[PDB]
Design a binder for this molecule. Structure first.
Ligand SMILES: Cc1cc2nc3c(=O)[nH]c(=O)nc-3n(C[C@H](O)[C@H](O)[C@@H](O)COP(=O)(O)OP(=O)(O)OC[C@H]3O[C@@H](n4cnc5c(N)ncnc54)[C@H](O)[C@@H]3O)c2cc1C
Ligand code: HEM
Ligand code: HEM
Ligand code: HEM
Ligand code: HEM
Ligand SMILES: O=C(O)/C=C/C(=O)O
Ligand code: NA
Length: 568
């Protein structure tokens, strides 16, 4: 057969997958995926039949309920979603090579005829607020507006939920929490504010950083009340004390937080629509929001009538063409992001009158795996690992800010470096076992053997770790001034991960005030329009601190939903 439907119709009727009249149920293909499951079982049941030692197409780190049609189309060949970041040996029936080529908002102006027909029709739905984006900020806004009495519709352009938020690892920053007190840590919102402004080179808007520090504990409390585990508290770069909260044992914070938000949305019966892209914010004759035009992949264009729209579409770090026009030093670099993080949300905000700010400030994460092409958490360094070059020496304070750490690594021989750690560091952070499972953390029982395996001077490496452990014992790094030295690298076996910088976060975006309202270039509010999360600018200034984006998306998403519900 040439496609999956052709295979099935040799022995089945059309109504085995379709509704009685044949129309597609909705853009999430709810009815159709329910029929796949009726014969094959749930995704976890299918996964029992497709196990590999270290990977499985049907049992991954993605949260929520991943629809079968995310990867299996019926009437045409289709792509494996995991191929956008990995290259596992798969043999999916009727597959084609991964390729993402989404039309821009400007190119969609070519659908003049279909769009005018949709806008001439009745609105498909009439609600109070529409939220665009199913990342951490969007789910937070949808839940808080619903809890404040508003009727919401939440839309997502991709086939799966979570955006970049589901990939987060290192933690969520907050001060002075009950969780910090239980681990004997002393902190304050004032200290988090001061670290944040200094880390951003004082470019941040101080009123928005005051919202970030002062609401941080309340956001950790709100997530914990909904069922999240934020009890493990570690250190990230540029922080005075440990404040990055994540699950017990050092597991990833992102997939966990997104799964909690999704379960809480399902409990409240929130209308969530996949494969549905927001295209154009609609405004009335007085300049206030009246609704939004959307494009469903399977059902086409339609509009929703509403008093408020909350844009929560994330950043644009996957789009290297746009990144290079703003910061040419990052042209041609690989990215840590999901395939849809290209900035179309910024285009929608500008078309509605919103102004942008700080667009030139873009962050490279210092440690992407050279072998796997995926981000390696900064929590590996925070829990104790060091960085060495090909000559086997340390060369930088490993917990400095990301701008300085990326530059340092690029200055070394081969433009890459190695994370080095032992079993004491491995057992303190369970996320490290995920890098061992991916095959990007080679190990040996001596540093001479490990240096030979990877191309690092072995004698120098051995001497480097001995000296570092001596610095840890005395309490002061006289070589690179690293201010926190948590563990000596001397238990069990040794591990190396080859790393280099990659494009990771865009600190600029739509201009918002402290109530999350979007403003134009004259600094006037656009009534009914809100923004929250990485789509906004002014919170992180010239360099974001690790742990501060998960904090931002919960705080500003929650505030935007409450403000939009009150606006009504
Ligand atoms: C690998 C990785 C690890 C990270 N680790 C951490 C961590 O440990 N700590 C931390 O502080 N931050 C971390 N970050 C940053 C953090 O995950 C991001 O800032 C993300 O949390 C921002 O969330 P968001 O809700 O604004 O956007 P996202 O989570 O990116 O979600 C936005 C959603 O909007 C959808 N969308 C876009 N345009 C449209 C449209 N027109 N119509 C409909 N839907 C649309 C996108 O497809 C996406 O699903 C990490 C980022 C990455 C990529
Ligand atoms: C979009 C919906 C569905 C998806 C994604 C899906 C998935 C698949 C795939 C990937 C195959 C393997 C094809 C090949 O070997 O070339 C398959 C085969 C098969 N499917 Fe489906 N399926 C769907 C709907 C259904 C339904 C509704 C039924 C039953 C009424 C069904 C019953 C079967 C059977 C009997 C086989 C042959 C192998 C076996 O006996 O398990 N499928 N399906
Ligand atoms: C001869 C039998 C069938 C007929 C006549 C038929 C008809 C159609 C049509 C006309 C569409 C597009 C509708 C639109 O654009 O609005 C469609 C899409 C679709 N059909 Fe079928 N269908 C048949 C069998 C099946 C089978 C056996 C399956 C599943 C195994 C299936 C699953 C789907 C799905 C998931 C879609 C959405 C797009 C895609 O994945 O290709 N159909 N079908
Ligand atoms: C419940 C939802 C789904 C069903 C019922 C389904 C069905 C199937 C079936 C019947 C097979 C063939 C297994 C065999 O050889 O015995 C298969 C293979 C495969 N499917 Fe799915 N699928 C689902 C969701 C997905 C999703 C979401 C993805 C991608 C993330 C995916 C990607 C693949 C791949 C890559 C293979 C080949 C696996 C390998 O080579 O190890 N499927 N699927
Ligand atoms: C359904 C699709 C996918 C599958 C089956 C898959 C599979 C895996 C596997 C087997 C690992 C090693 C650790 C583990 O066993 O969980 C891993 C790690 C990782 N994957 Fe994926 N992956 C998928 C999609 C993606 C995509 C699209 C991205 C990036 C946007 C991504 C980003 C990462 C990262 C950053 C890691 C490092 C470890 C961690 O952060 O937990 N994955 N993945
Ligand atoms: O886990 C990391 O390294 C990412 C943290 C962040 O981008 O804030
Ligand atoms: Na931003």
């Amino acid at each position: 057969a040439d496609n999956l439907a052709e295979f099935h119709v040799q022995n089945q009727e059309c109504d085995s997958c379709h509704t009685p009249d044949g129309e597609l149920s909705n853009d999430s293909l709810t009815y159709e995926n329910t029929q796949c499951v009726s014969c094959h079982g749930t995704l976890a049941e299918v996964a029992e039949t497709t196990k590999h030692e270290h990977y499985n197409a049907h049992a991954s780190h993605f949260p929520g309920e991943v629809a079968c049609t995310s990867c299996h189309s019926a009437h045409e060949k289709s792509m494996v979603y995991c191929d956008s970041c990995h290259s596992f040996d798969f043999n999916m029936p009727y597959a084609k090579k991964w390729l993402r080529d989404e039309p821009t908002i400007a190119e969609l102006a070519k659908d003049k005829s279909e769009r005018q027909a949709a806008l001439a029709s009745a609105p498909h739905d009439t609600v109070d607020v529409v939220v665009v984006g199913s990342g951490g900020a969007g789910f937070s806004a949808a839940i808080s507006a619903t809890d404040s009495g508003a009727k919401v519709i939440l839309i997502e352009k991709e086939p799966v939920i979570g955006g970049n938020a589901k990939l987060a690892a290192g933690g969520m920053n907050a001060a002075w929490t009950d969780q910090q007190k239980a681990k004997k840590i002393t902190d304050s919102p004032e200290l988090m504010f001061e670290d944040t402004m200094k880390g951003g080179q004082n470019i941040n808007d101080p009123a928005l950083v005051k919202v970030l520090s002062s609401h941080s504990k309340d956001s950790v409390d709100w997530m914990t009340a909904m069922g999240a585990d934020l009890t493990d508290v570690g250190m990230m770069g540029g922080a005075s004390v440990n404040r990055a909260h994540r699950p017990t044992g050092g597991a990833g914070v992102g997939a966990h937080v997104v799964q909690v938000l999704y379960d809480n949305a399902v409990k409240r019966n929130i209308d969530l629509r996949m494969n549905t892209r927001g295209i154009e914010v609609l405004k009335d004759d007085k300049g206030t929001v009246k609704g939004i035009l959307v494009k469903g992949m399977y059902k086409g264009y339609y509009w929703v009538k509403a008093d408020a729209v909350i844009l929560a579409t994330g950043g644009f770090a996957k789009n290297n063409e746009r990144v290079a026009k703003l910061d040419p030093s990052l042209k041609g670099f690989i990215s840590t992001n999901q395939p849809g993080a290209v900035g179309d949300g910024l285009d929608v905000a500008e078309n509605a009158g919103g102004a942008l700010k700080d667009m030139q400030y873009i962050q490279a994460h210092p440690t992407l795996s050279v072998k796997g092409g995926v981000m390696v958490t900064e929590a590996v360094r925070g829990n104790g690992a060091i960085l060495v070059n090909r000559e086997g020496k340390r060369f930088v304070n490993e917990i400095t800010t990301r701008d300085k750490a990326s530059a340092a690594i690029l200055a070394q021989t081969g433009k890459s470096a190695y994370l080095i750690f032992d079993d004491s560091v491995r057992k303190s952070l369970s996320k490290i076992d995920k890098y061992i499972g991916l095959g990007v953390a080679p190990t040996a029982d001596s540093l001479v053997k490990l240096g030979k395996m990877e191309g690092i001077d072995g004698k120098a490496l051995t001497e480097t770790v001995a000296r570092y452990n001596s610095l840890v014992s005395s309490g002061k790094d006289t070589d690179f001034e690293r201010p926190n030295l948590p563990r000596a690298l001397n238990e069990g076996n040794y591990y190396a991960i080859e790393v280099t910088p990659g494009v990771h976060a865009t600190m600029g975006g739509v201009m918002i005030d402290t109530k999350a309202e979007v403003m134009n270039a004259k600094k006037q509010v656009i009534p009914g329009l809100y923004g929250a999360g990485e789509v906004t600018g002014g919170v992180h200034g010239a360099n974001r601190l690790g742990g501060n984006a998960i904090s931002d998306i919960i705080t500003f998403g929650r505030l935007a939903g409450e403000e939009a519900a009150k606006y009504s």
